[PDB]
Every structure is written in C-alpha cells, then in structure tokens.
Design a protein around this ligand. Structure first.
Ligand SMILES: CNc1nc(Cl)nc2c1ncn2Cc1cccc(Cl)c1
Length: 164
C-alpha cells in the first residue's frame, strides 16, 4: 500500500538532486550516501534539523528521468571512506567532502513525461523536472511527485518511520 509512504512524506521537505552521471547515483543506491556542493550541503543541514523528513529526489542529467528518492538520515559528516565518486569536469573531491547518510524510499525510475502536470512554486511554477541541483520543491508538489513513482516493494518503510 501507500499508507506508510504517505506518513513518511507528511510535513516533509523535498529537494531536487541533479547528478551529472549515473555512476554516482548507482553508488548512492549501493552505499546509502550522497554528497553535494557546499552551497547545497548547508541548505540540507538546515533542512534536516527543521523537518521530520528531508527527501532527496534524484535525476541524472540528460536521462529524461528521475532515478528514485531517499530520506536524509543524518547531517553531513566529514572523514572516512573517500567515496569513489566519478568526478565531473569542474569537480574536486574536496567539494564532495561532506557525506550525508540516506535511506532509499524508492529506487525505481520515473520518466519526466509522467510529471508534466506538476509545477514547483519555488521555481516560478516551472515543471518540477526543471531546476538546478539543490532546488527546493514545495510540499504539495513534492508529495505528488513522490506518489507518482512506481511502488518499490523491495523496501520496508517500518524502519524509516522509527528513525523519525
Ligand atoms: C556525488 N555528487 C554529485 N555527482 C555528480 Cl556526477 N554531479 C553532481 C553532484 N552533486 C551535484 N552535481 C551536479 C553538478 C553541480 C555543479 C558542477 C558539476 Cl561538474 C556537477
């Protein structure tokens, strides 16, 4: 069902994550971690303290799709396993310092064609697929977007609810 999912999304905050390549999203799904640039890292740390759930919605640039969504389980933390991110052009490993732990809620894809009816008030009511890395998505838009993804029956949200 969708009842536990709706409970996790209650009063959540949502952020669009834009990755330049598929390898980093695959790594994030395997290891339960994400790293972003310092401007977005500061925003996510503030949001994590402010809301019962902070949801990252992932899209690989040029894929025409979202690749899933996950809930922050921690603020960013430095020191340890230099996650073997595949660095794009103007990207250092010091920029991707700061590792958040995340719990995946859905690892299934959603094509942009399915979200064309959803606009984001925090980005001028442009279609929710449009936005820079770190763009916040308003509650109602974000909730509806997450509910469009195919159910991921491999995930049990019982443990996620207990983190809350
Ligand atoms: C593991 N984290 C990330 N991995 C990848 Cl491949 N792209 C990311 C990531 N975070 C933001 N972006 C998009 C981007 C923003 C500004 C400059 C560049 Cl070159 C790319």
């Amino acid at each position: 069902g969708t009842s536990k999912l709706k409970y996790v999304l209650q009063d959540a905050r949502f952020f669009l994550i834009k990755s330049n390549n598929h390898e980093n999203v695959s790594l994030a799904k395997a290891k339960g971690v994400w790293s972003t640039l310092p401007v977005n890292e500061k925003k996510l740390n503030l949001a994590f303290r402010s809301a019962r759930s902070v949801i990252l919605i992932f899209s690989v640039r040029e894929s025409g799709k979202f690749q899933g969504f996950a809930r922050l389980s921690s603020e960013s933390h430095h020191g340890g396993s230099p996650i073997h991110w595949v660095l794009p052009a103007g990207m250092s490993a010091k920029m991707l310092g700061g590792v958040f732990k995340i719990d995946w809620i859905c690892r299934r894809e959603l094509p942009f064609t399915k979200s064309a009816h959803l606009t984001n008030p925090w980005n001028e009511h442009k279609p929710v697929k449009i936005g820079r890395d770190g763009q916040e998505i308003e509650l109602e838009c974000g909730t509806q977007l997450c509910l469009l993804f195919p159910p991921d029956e491999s995930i049990d949200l019982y443990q996620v609810i207990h983190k809350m």
